[PDB]
Amino acid sequence: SEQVEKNKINNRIAXXXXXXXXXXXXXXXXXXXXXXXXXXXXXXXXXX
C-alpha cells in the first residue's frame, strides 16, 4: 500500500564543488538557461 503509494509520488513533483554545481544546474538547454543567466553564469563562473 504505502510503498506503492510512495511509488507514484515520484513522477509527481514536477572539483567536487564544481561538479555539484554543474549538476544541480543542468536545465541549461531546457530553455537556454545559460543565456537568461543561471546555467551560463553559474557554469562559466564556478567552472573557469
Binding site: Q3, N7, X19, X23, X28, X34, X40, X43, X47
Partner: protein, 204 residues
C-alpha cells in the same frame, strides 16, 4: 547473544516461513557481519520494500553475494530497488551501472553524474556517441564530460564537425581548458624566466 553461532539459527528460520520475527533479532545484531544476516536480511528489505534500512543495512557490513541479489531487484517495477540494484551492481565500480542502460533507466539525471568518476576515458565517446543518436541533452553531455581535467580531446571536438555542422555551440568548458592551458603557460614562462634571470646573473 554471546555464545551462539548464528550460522546454525537463521537456517532453522528460513525453511520455517517465519524468519521475520527475528527482524529485530537482527537489529542489535548484524555487527557480526554474518552472511545469513545480510543475505536473507536483504531478501527481507526487498519483498518488504525497505530501502532506508536495506541501504544502511549494507552501508557498512559488506558480507554477501554481490550479484544475484541485484538480480531480483532489477525484476521490479518500483525503481527504488531498480535504482539501487543499479547501485548494488555498480558498487565502487562505476563501469557496470552505465554500460547497462538503454531507453529505460536512462535517467537524464544520475546518468550525467555516474560517468564523471569513471576512469575508462573512452567510455565518454561511448556515452556521447550515444547521446547523439538517441538523446538531445548532448549539451550537458559533451560538457560535464570536458570540465573534469580533459577527457574530451580534439578527437571529439572534431567528430562534431564532420558530423553535425549545426549543433555544437555551447562552451563553458572548452575555454576553462584554454586559459588553463594559458595559465600553466603563465607559471611555465615564469620559471623559464627564473632560469634566464639566474643564469645571466651568475654568468655576466
Amino acid at each position: 547473544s554471546p555464545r551462539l553461532d548464528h550460522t546454525r539459527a537463521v537456517n532453522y528460520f528460513s525453511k520455517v516461513k517465519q524468519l521475520p520475527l527475528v527482524k529485530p533479532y537482527l537489529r542489535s545484531v548484524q555487527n557480526h557481519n554474518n552472511k545469513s544476516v545480510n543475505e536473507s536480511l536483504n531478501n527481507l528489505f526487498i519483498t518488504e520494500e525497505d530501502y532506508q534500512a536495506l541501504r544502511t543495512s549494507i552501508d557498512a557490513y559488506d558480507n554477501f553475494d554481490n550479484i544475484s541479489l541485484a538480480q531480483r531487484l532489477e525484476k521490479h517495477e518500483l525503481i527504488e530497488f531498480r535504482r539501487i540494484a543499479a547501485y548494488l551492481f555498480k558498487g565502487n565500480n562505476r563501469w557496470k551501472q552505465s554500460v547497462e542502460l538503454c531507453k529505460k533507466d536512462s535517467l537524464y539525471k544520475d546518468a550525467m553524474q555516474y560517468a564523471s568518476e569513471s576512469k575508462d576515458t573512452e567510455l565518454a565517446e561511448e556515452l556521447l556517441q550515444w547521446f547523439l543518436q538517441e538523446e538531445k541533452r548532448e549539451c550537458f553531455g559533451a560538457c560535464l564530460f570536458t570540465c573534469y581535467d580533459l577527457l574530451r580531446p580534439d578527437v571529439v571536438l572534431e567528430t562534431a564537425w564532420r558530423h553535425n555542422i549545426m549543433d555544437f555551440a555551447m562552451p563553458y568548458f572548452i575555454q576553462v581548458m584554454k586559459e588553463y592551458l594559458t595559465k600553466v603557460d603563465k607559471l611555465d614562462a615564469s620559471e623559464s624566466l627564473r632560469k634566464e634571470e639566474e643564469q645571466a646573473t651568475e654568468t655576466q
